[PDB]
Amino acid sequence: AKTTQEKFDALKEAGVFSGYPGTTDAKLGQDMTRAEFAKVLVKLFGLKEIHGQYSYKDKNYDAKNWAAPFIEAVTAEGLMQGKDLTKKIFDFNGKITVEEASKTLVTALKLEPVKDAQNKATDWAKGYFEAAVNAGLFSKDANPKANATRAQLVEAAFAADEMS
Ligand SMILES: [Cl-]
Ligand SMILES: [Cl-]
């Protein structure tokens, strides 16, 4: 049984997660931005970065934003969409949620959302969260609406990698 720390160390070795300067602390209790999570997905699934395309209207979403090539890759791949679709806002500094991460991973693994799933997720996500739980990516007792912890994302990424 690998611990969350051992799963993180393996993912860091692989270039999927990064740690922090000066310490071996992986901050497993802390949160992750949507920009960072798009980079995680690009590394985890070996996606091509997309330069010189900008699908969203967020302020400071341009060539000087380090995250755009990753955000564009997960967008073209169908993994992430904006937080709001009429204004085309990605919310790159916003934190990724359990249920958002669930939808990305379920889609990337070509799994099927569960129809008429009953759980605490936002309506759009109930099926994705349920599919993610059933695949072992998140615990049934996780809060789907919460910001996902780095621990949770490590576990989910690790499991997804094994399924691929
Ligand atoms: Cl921590
Ligand atoms: Cl969990």
Numbering used by the authors: 28 to 191
What did the authors write?
Prokaryotic cell envelopes often include proteinaceous surface (S-) layers composed of self-assembling subunits in porous two-dimensional crystalline lattices. S-layer anchoring is best characterized for Gram-positive bacteria, where S-layer proteins non-covalently attach to the PG layer via species- and strain-specific non-classical secondary cell wall polymers (SCWPs). SpaA possesses three consecutive SLH domains near its N-terminus, followed by a large C-terminal region presumed to harbor the self-assembling domain(s). The crystal structures and binding analyses presented here of P. alvei SpaASLH, SpaASLH/G109A, and SpaASLH/G46A/G109A with synthetic SCWP fragments provide novel insights into the functional contributions of many conserved SLH domain residues, including SLH-Trp13, SLH-Gly29, and SLH-Arg43, which precisely interlock from three different SLH domains to generate two active binding sites.
Here we report crystal structures of the SLH domains of SpaA, unliganded and in complex with synthesized monosaccharide and disaccharide building blocks of P. alvei CCM 2051T SCWP. The TRAE, TVEE, and TRAQ motifs of SpaA are located at the N-termini of the core helices adjacent to three grooves (labeled here G1, G2, and G3). The TRAE and TRAQ motifs each contribute to two of the three grooves, as their arginine residues thread under the connecting loops of the adjacent SLH domains and into the neighboring grooves. In the case of SLH2, Val125 of the TVEE motif corresponds in position to the conserved SLH-Arg43 of the TRAE and TRAQ motifs but does not protrude into the neighboring G3. In the initial liganded and unliganded structures, multiple conformations were observed for residues 44–54 that form the connecting loop between the two helices of SLH1 beside G1. The loop makes unique crystal contacts in each case and has mean B-factors elevated between 4 and 49% of the molecule mean. In both G1 and G2, the non-conserved SLH-28 residue is observed to make a hydrogen bond from its backbone carbonyl to the side chain of the conserved SLH-Arg43 of the TRAE motif. The hydrogen bond between the SLH-28 backbone carbonyl and SLH-Arg43 in the unliganded state may support the proper folding of the SLH domain trimer, as these residues precisely interlock between neighboring SLH domains.
